[PDB]
Amino acid sequence: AKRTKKVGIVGKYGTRYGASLRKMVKKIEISQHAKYTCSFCGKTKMKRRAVGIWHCGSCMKTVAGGAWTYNTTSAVTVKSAIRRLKELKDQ
Amino acid sequence: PRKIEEIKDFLLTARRKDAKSVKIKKNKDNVKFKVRCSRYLYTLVITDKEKAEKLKQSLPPGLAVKELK
Amino acid sequence: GKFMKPGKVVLVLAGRYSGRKAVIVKNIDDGTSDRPYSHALVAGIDRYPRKVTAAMGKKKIAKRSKIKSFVKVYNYNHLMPTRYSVDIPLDKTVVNKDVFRDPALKRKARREAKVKFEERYKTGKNKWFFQKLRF
Amino acid sequence: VQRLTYRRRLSYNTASNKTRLSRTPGNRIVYLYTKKVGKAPKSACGVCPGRLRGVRAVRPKVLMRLSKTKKHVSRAYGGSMCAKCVRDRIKRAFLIEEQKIVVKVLKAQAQSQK
RNA sequence: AUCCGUAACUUCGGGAUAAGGAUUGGCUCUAAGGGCUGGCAGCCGACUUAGAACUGGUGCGGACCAGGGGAAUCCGACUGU
RNA sequence: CGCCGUUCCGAAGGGACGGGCGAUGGCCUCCGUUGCCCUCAGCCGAUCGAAAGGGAGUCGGGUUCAGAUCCCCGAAUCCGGAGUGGCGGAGAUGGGCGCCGCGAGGCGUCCAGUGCGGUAACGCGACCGAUCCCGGAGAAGCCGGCGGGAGCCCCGGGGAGAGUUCUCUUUUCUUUGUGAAGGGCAGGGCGCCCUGGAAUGGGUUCGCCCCGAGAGAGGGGCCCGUGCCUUGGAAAGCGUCGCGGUUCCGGCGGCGUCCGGUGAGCUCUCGCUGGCCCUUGAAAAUCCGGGGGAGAGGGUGUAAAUCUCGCGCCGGGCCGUA
Ligand SMILES: [Mg+2]
Ligand SMILES: [Mg+2]
Ligand SMILES: [Mg+2]
Ligand SMILES: [Mg+2]
Ligand SMILES: [Mg+2]
Ligand SMILES: [Mg+2]
Ligand SMILES: [Mg+2]
Ligand SMILES: [Mg+2]
Ligand SMILES: [Mg+2]
Ligand SMILES: [Mg+2]
Ligand SMILES: [Mg+2]
Ligand SMILES: [Mg+2]
Ligand SMILES: [Mg+2]
Ligand SMILES: [Mg+2]
Ligand SMILES: [Zn+2]
Ligand SMILES: [Zn+2]
């Protein structure tokens, strides 16, 4: 059964810290505790070990990722930019 | 302590230069021959009372013997 | 098509002889009642001949050129096949699957592969076979 | 019920003061101080989470008085690297060395044409 | 402790043991909740819950243990010092 | 007076496998030791710093007015040493050819022999090897759930002693052992192996969670086994009854130390799995394995080098301890 209407994971904090801060931290709490599909082995096991450190329990690979998400939008953009500059550099 | 299974191995143990004595212990179910060597007390457990007497004669001459009670 | 044939050089992947190079003597792709899986009888170099150089004397070269061989039956999954083939004629009357019954025949089987390998080693042919894999 | 005391002057419950209860021929409970739990070796591959097999799990200074057979496995790298990663290194070493011959041959052929 | 019941307001998490009621002993029973061996049979068992009769000068969380409550105003968000 | 500084403005190594030149000795055969030269050489920081951290290895019984894991009895174990360090075992002892013999085998030559088993996980009593290199252990937080083993508690019976008994109570109370180390076997755990190939998906936990990167199902392997059995070891300890003495004797005897059940119970421990962190929860001494293959060992025996195997030999000083 649905146990809360809107707090969800930030129901652990009760009434404290304010609705907007709890609303903000809810987005991060879901993402930083999610299990992502590993791109090396395909199993949904990519889990955060520390801030910025993501580890897959199946293939044992470790990845330098984002603080709360597996990869950041900034890092994804930079990889494409570095890929494009590499082609032009050697044509 | 080490436990000896066969009579031959006990006799070899009883003839060792470091063997110091042999104790005979008589129980209700077995007779135990224990030879005090340098490191271990070796024990032969015999369930046949007849074999115990045959073995008791076969012990080396010089080796001191004690019957426990 | 099929390639696990006699003379094929294979790498032992599992067991006491992992990383040793061997040669298929007899291949059984369909298995048997004793070994339902696919297996081959192989002969292999337990100990490789040592490196020899012109600075070494005749008697030292002969000492370093002695090979210790092994004879084994292997599951196909425990072998890595290679593109190399090695055509030493190994007497099959002595090197066969019946040598695993008594060590007297197994000693002859290993003696047979020892002599044939050493003779083939000294010719300089099949150099890759007689070089240890460095992994 | 009988209540226990330490048999040494370390009155504190530290990692080196662990005990187990033992009944004696005198029919009493005393403390026996246990030895720390030893660990089997970790594979040198740095990848496999499990520990190795065929090796005694003892404190590191106990290995000195064990025979060699108790501290390794009859296999290349045995007792230091897992079986799974020894199979991988054999294939990797062989397969990579073949590609060097493949790449070298193409380079020689290209130079031959050039 | 069990059973019922619970408002304003709210950051929807609370407020909340909100507030407000009823019950509680002893004794004799009933039902349900399992394991082992070979839709059944036999043999073992662990405390629980619910229900009913009877019963005492309405006494029963009998000692001990154990929140008074509500409506508001000021200040500081809170926990912490 | 000194202070800063601890790798920073430093010619910071007094070591070594091995090789070559000598000198001395001895179980004078030849080996040690020793001097020089050659060769090789990161550690990169003296030293101090914990009676709760790291750190090999000792337990049971008895004993005093006062000490005992220290004394005595018994049973062990670690470290170091001995090559005059001894004995076994391993290395080790095979095959071809030629003679002799009916054969068993015996002689002569020529070759091999730094072990062997398993498909595998890995196993076996050892099972050569240096500079160098890689790795492991020491060595890792807090919290939750669950499971295994113990001690304790509880329940049903047998004993032995005691209490109550005006009435009742086959009753109530007490007590009813087995050390370390070795061997074996339960039990627990495995992200270990082999066959095979799975959707009508299945397996599975309190929760989870797992699978074509190989699930179920079969058959194996390994680690811990503090549990039980066995040697220890009944000889001891305890209970009870009965005898002795100088009677201040480890005094001597009989009997007993037995059979089952149960639990989200409490304590300890081992293990599995999860959660939390903008917190990620020591270092070192010390020990080990592996990779490599410089070398050494004997020429078929009187076998050698060598051995982390089994025995055996010697030693462990100093300070604390009521
Ligand atoms: Mg300490
Ligand atoms: Mg025990
Ligand atoms: Mg082993
Ligand atoms: Mg209120
Ligand atoms: Mg106001
Ligand atoms: Mg305040
Ligand atoms: Mg303060
Ligand atoms: Mg110091
Ligand atoms: Mg200290
Ligand atoms: Mg002592
Ligand atoms: Mg399976
Ligand atoms: Mg007795
Ligand atoms: Mg090697
Ligand atoms: Mg004291
Ligand atoms: Zn992965
Ligand atoms: Zn690995």
Swiss-Prot record, chain A:
Ranges annotated as C4-type zinc finger: 38-59
InterPro entries per the UniProt record, alphabetical: Ribosomal_eL37/eL43 (IPR011331), Ribosomal_eL43 (IPR002674), Ribosomal_zn-bd (IPR011332)
Binding site for Zn(2+): C38, C41, C56, C59
GO cellular component, one term: cytosolic large ribosomal subunit
Compartment annotation: Cytoplasm
Domain of life according to the entry: Eukaryota
Pfam family of the protein (one): Ribosomal_L37ae
Alphabetical UniProt keywords: Cytoplasm, Metal-binding, Ribonucleoprotein, Ribosomal protein, Zinc, Zinc-finger
Gene3D superfamilies listed in its UniProt record: 2.20.25.30
Bilayer-spanning residue ranges: none
Gene Ontology biological-process annotations: translation
GO molecular function annotations of the record: large ribosomal subunit rRNA binding; structural constituent of ribosome; zinc ion binding
Task of the protein: Component of the large ribosomal subunit. The ribosome is a large ribonucleoprotein complex responsible for the synthesis of proteins in the cell.
Family per record: Belongs to the eukaryotic ribosomal protein eL43 family.
Subunit note: Component of the large ribosomal subunit.
The protein's name: Large ribosomal subunit protein eL43
Native species: Oryctolagus cuniculus
Swiss-Prot record, chain B:
A cellular component annotation (GO) from this entry: cytosolic large ribosomal subunit
Location(s) in or outside the cell: Cytoplasm
Pfam family, one: Ribosomal_L38e
Keyword entries, A-Z: Acetylation, Cytoplasm, Isopeptide bond, Ribonucleoprotein, Ribosomal protein, Ubl conjugation
GO molecular function: structural constituent of ribosome
Annotated InterPro entries: Ribosomal_eL38, Ribosomal_eL38_sf
Gene: RPL38
Function in brief: Component of the large ribosomal subunit. The ribosome is a large ribonucleoprotein complex responsible for the synthesis of proteins in the cell.
KW Ubl conjugation (keyword) present: yes
GO BP field: protein-RNA complex assembly; translation
Domain of life: Eukaryota
Crosslinked residue numbers (Glycyl lysine isopeptide (Lys-Gly) (interchain with G-Cter in SUMO2)): K3, K8
Family: Belongs to the eukaryotic ribosomal protein eL38 family.
Keyword Lyase attributed: no
Subunit description: Component of the large ribosomal subunit.
Residues with N6-acetyllysine modification: K8, K66
Record-given protein name: Large ribosomal subunit protein eL38
From Swiss-Prot, chain C:
Database matches in SMART domains: KOW
Subcellular localization(s) per the UniProt record: Cytoplasm, Cytosol; Cytoplasm; Rough endoplasmic reticulum
Top-level taxon of origin: Eukaryota
BP terms from Gene Ontology: translation
InterPro entries: KOW, Ribosomal_eL27, Ribosomal_eL27_CS, Ribosomal_eL27_KOW, Ribosomal_eL27_sf, Translation_prot_SH3-like_sf
Keywords, in A-Z order: Acetylation, Cytoplasm, Endoplasmic reticulum, Ribonucleoprotein, Ribosomal protein
N6-acetyllysine PTM positions: K26, K92
Domain KOW: 6-35
GO molecular function: structural constituent of ribosome
Family label: Belongs to the eukaryotic ribosomal protein eL27 family.
Subunit description: Component of the large ribosomal subunit. Interacts with RRP1B. Interacts with DHX33.
Function: Component of the large ribosomal subunit. Required for proper rRNA processing and maturation of 28S and 5.8S rRNAs.
Protein's name in the database: Large ribosomal subunit protein eL27
Organism: Oryctolagus cuniculus (Rabbit)
The gene coding this protein: RPL27
UniProtKB/Swiss-Prot annotation, chain D:
GO biological process: translation
Subcellular location field: Cytoplasm, Cytosol; Cytoplasm; Endoplasmic reticulum
Positions bearing the Glycyl lysine isopeptide (Lys-Gly) (interchain with G-Cter in SUMO2) cross-link: K107
Entry keyword annotation includes Phosphoprotein: yes
Highest taxon of the lineage: Eukaryota
GO annotation, cellular component aspect: cytosol; endoplasmic reticulum; ribonucleoprotein complex; ribosome
InterPro entries: Ribosomal_eL34, Ribosomal_eL34_C_sf, Ribosomal_eL34_CS
Keyword Nucleotide-binding in record: no
GO molecular function, one term: structural constituent of ribosome
Record's subunit section: Component of the large ribosomal subunit.
Record's function text: Component of the large ribosomal subunit. The ribosome is a large ribonucleoprotein complex responsible for the synthesis of proteins in the cell.
Family to which this protein belongs: Belongs to the eukaryotic ribosomal protein eL34 family.
Protein name per UniProt: Large ribosomal subunit protein eL34
